Amino acid sequence: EFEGRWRVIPHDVLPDWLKDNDFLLHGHRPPMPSFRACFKSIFRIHTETGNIWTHLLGCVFFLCLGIFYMFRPNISFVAPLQEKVVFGLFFLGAILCLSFSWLFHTVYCHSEGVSRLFSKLDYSGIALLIMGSFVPWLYYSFYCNPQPCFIYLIVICVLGIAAIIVSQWDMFATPQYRGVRAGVFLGLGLSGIIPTLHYVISEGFLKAATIGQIGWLMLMASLYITGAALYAARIPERFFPGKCDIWFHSHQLFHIFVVAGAFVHFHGVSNLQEFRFMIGGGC
Numbered sequence: 541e542f543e544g545r546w547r548v549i550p551h552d553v554l555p556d557w558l559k560d561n562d563f564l565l566h567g568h569r570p571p572m573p574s575f576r577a578c579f580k581s582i583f584r585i586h587t588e589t590g591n592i593w594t595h596l597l598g599c600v601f602f603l604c605l606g607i608f609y610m611f612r613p614n615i616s617f618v619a620p621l622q623e624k625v626v627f628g629l630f631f632l633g634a635i636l637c638l639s640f641s642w643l644f645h646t647v648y649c650h651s652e653g654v655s656r657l658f659s660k661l662d663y664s665g666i667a668l669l670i671m672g673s674f675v676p677w678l679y680y681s682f683y684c685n686p687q688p689c690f691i692y693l694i695v696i697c698v699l700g701i702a703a704i705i706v707s708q709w710d711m712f713a714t715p716q717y718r719g720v721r722a723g724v725f726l727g728l729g730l731s732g733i734i735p736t737l738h739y740v741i742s743e744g745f746l747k748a749a750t751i752g753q754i755g756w757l758m759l760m761a762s763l764y765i766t767g768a769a770l771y772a773a774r775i776p777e778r779f780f781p782g783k784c785d786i787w788f789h790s791h792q793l794f795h796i797f798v799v800a801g802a803f804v805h806f807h808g809v810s811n812l813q814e815f816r817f818m819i820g821g822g823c
């Protein structure tokens with residue numbers, strides 16, 4: 541092609557709004573105020589290539605996985621409509637998080653205005669992934685106890701809506717605030733420790749770990765805390781500057797942790813449903 545030709549540029553000659561991680565020293569797409577060129581760049585090697593494809597394939601996969609869930613026989617469920625509305629809110633959340641992500645990562649270099657608009661959709665999308673992952677979880681964990689399930693849905697909604705408001709703050713999207721971000725999204729996730737404690741208090745140390753939720757919750761909190769640490773600490777590009785430009789840098793790794801994280805979380809709540817089916821909807 542002879543339309544929208546461009547070359548990868550080193551870090552130093554990026555405009556301030558594109559200067560994100562100073563450990564990725566080269567392979568940067570230059571400012572191109574063409575969506576035509578931005579979306580064509582999905583088929584090009586550059587810093588953002590991996591970030592785009594991880595959350596682009598992860599998005600098609602959750603759209604694929606969520607559709608197959610809707611069309612599951614109603615005999616599989618205890619209350620198929622209710623059960624599907626809860627998983628649907630998880631799938632919608634997961635899909636929106638990744639769609640906002642890969643779209644933002646693709647159109648990132650377009651203009652300061654666009655970068656600003658789409659980053660606000662990026663950050664917000666993370667909160668949506670967290671809010672939606674709580675819905676089927678509280679539903680099964682608080683099946684026979686309805687007052688706490690309602691409370692904890694409101695708690696996650698309030699914290700989630702606060703996080704979404706904080707994502708709109710222009711100073712939040714600066715590299716100096718990169719840690720504040722990892723704390724805001726890590727706290728949002730780790731806040732599940734509140735209803736985890738409340739559940740162990742009521743059901744017991746036998747009931748909680750027998751029904752695999754303790755081992756599963758731990759793995760997920762490992763994924764959550766290790767995942768934020770990578771992003772905030774810019775590892776491994778902090779240790780090999782110029783070598784992690786196109787592959788396995790921290791954002792690219794964190795992207796894999798979000799797809800894996802959402803896949804582990806789905807596998808966990810999909811077990812709480814398989815089990816609630818065997819026992820039935822009683823008390």
Ligand SMILES: CCCCCCCC/C=C/CCCCCCCC(=O)OC[C@@H](O)CO
Pocket residue numbers: 573574575576579639
């Ligand atoms: C959630 C799904 C989202 C899918 C979005 C579409 C993906 C496929 C790619 C589309 C890119 C098409 C190019 C779109 C190009 C529009 C911008 C442009 O250069 O306009 C020129 C003039 O109007 C102004 O100078």
Ligand SMILES: CCCCCCCC/C=C/CCCCCCCC(=O)OC[C@@H](O)CO
Pocket residue numbers: 597600601604605607608609611612613
């Ligand atoms: C859309 C038609 C649905 C028909 C089947 C409905 C019957 C119940 C289905 C249960 C789940 C079956 C397996 C569902 C498999 C989900 C993952 C998926 O679709 O991945 C696609 C990827 O390869 C693309 O990246």
Ligand SMILES: CCCCCCCC/C=C/CCCCCCCC(=O)OC[C@@H](O)CO
Pocket residue numbers: 716717720723724726727730765
């Ligand atoms: C292992 C547990 C992880 C922690 C979970 C709880 C985290 C909750 C945190 C919420 C927000 C923390 C905000 C802390 C903000 C303090 C840093 C600051 O002011 O930096 C600004 C400058 O860098 C600008 O140049």
Ligand SMILES: CCCCCCCC/C=C\CCCCCCCC(=O)OC[C@@H](O)CO
Pocket residue numbers: 606607610611612613614615628631632
């Ligand atoms: C798809 C992931 C979630 C995103 C939101 C989608 C909202 C749903 C919108 C339209 C779909 C309406 C009809 C969805 C059809 C679901 C019921 C069904 O087919 O069950 C299979 C049974 O016949 C077996 O017993």
Ligand SMILES: CCCCCCCC/C=C\CCCCCCCC(=O)OC[C@@H](O)CO
Pocket residue numbers: 610614620621624625628629632
């Ligand atoms: C954010 C999206 C929330 C989820 C939207 C999709 C909800 C599930 C879709 C349809 C309701 C299915 C359960 C309805 C079950 C009705 C009883 C039955 O046996 O009906 C025959 C079935 O073939 C009818 O499906």
Ligand SMILES: CCCCCCCC/C=C\CCCCCCCC(=O)OC[C@@H](O)CO
Pocket residue numbers: 632635636639640643657661
């Ligand atoms: C299951 C369905 C999955 C849906 C994924 C949706 C992905 C696309 C998301 C966002 C595209 C929005 C682009 C919007 C760009 C519009 C330009 C404009 O004038 O902006 C002013 C306002 O828009 C500012 O708020």
Ligand SMILES: CCCCCCCC/C=C\CCCCCCCC(=O)OC[C@@H](O)CO
Pocket residue numbers: 636657660661664704708
């Ligand atoms: C342009 C700068 C501002 C950034 C964009 C604005 C913030 C984007 C936020 C969210 C986008 C997706 C919203 C997704 C909302 C899903 C619907 C929902 O929550 O329904 C609740 C009911 O099912 C039960 O009550």
Ligand SMILES: CCCCCCCC/C=C\CCCCCCCC(=O)OC[C@@H](O)CO
Pocket residue numbers: 622625626629630632633668671672675679682683684686689693697
């Ligand atoms: C982008 C998604 C963001 C997250 C959205 C969170 C808000 C969803 C609102 C309301 C919950 C909808 C599902 C409602 C599920 C509970 C209905 C019920 O009667 O439960 C009884 C059970 O506890 C025992 O059988």
Ligand SMILES: CCCCCCCC/C=C\CCCCCCCC(=O)OC[C@@H](O)CO
Pocket residue numbers: 699700702703706720723724725727728731
């Ligand atoms: C459990 C966590 C759930 C997330 C919801 C809460 C998110 C909001 C919390 C904290 C973000 C704000 C912290 C931002 C830290 C700096 C605030 C400040 O005063 O800056 C100006 C100074 O630099 C000079 O005067």
Ligand SMILES: CCCCCCCC/C=C\CCCCCCCC(=O)OC[C@@H](O)CO
Pocket residue numbers: 670673674677729730731732733734736737740745749754757758760761805
């Ligand atoms: C994406 C949402 C995933 C679900 C919510 C996760 C929120 C993070 C909070 C907590 C997860 C880690 C819980 C770790 C386990 C806490 C309960 C406990 O003290 O168990 C004692 C037993 O181990 C004795 O055998």
Ligand SMILES: CCCCCCCC/C=C\CCCCCCCC(=O)O
Pocket residue numbers: 662663666673721722723725726729763764765767768771791794797798799800801802805
């Ligand atoms: C269920 C999913 C869990 C998977 C791991 C999540 C890691 C912890 C969450 C947040 C910390 C980092 C968030 C950084 C903000 C911007 C993110 C971005 O643009 O990719």
Ligand SMILES: [Zn+2]
Pocket residue numbers: 591641645662791795
């Ligand atoms: Zn990202």
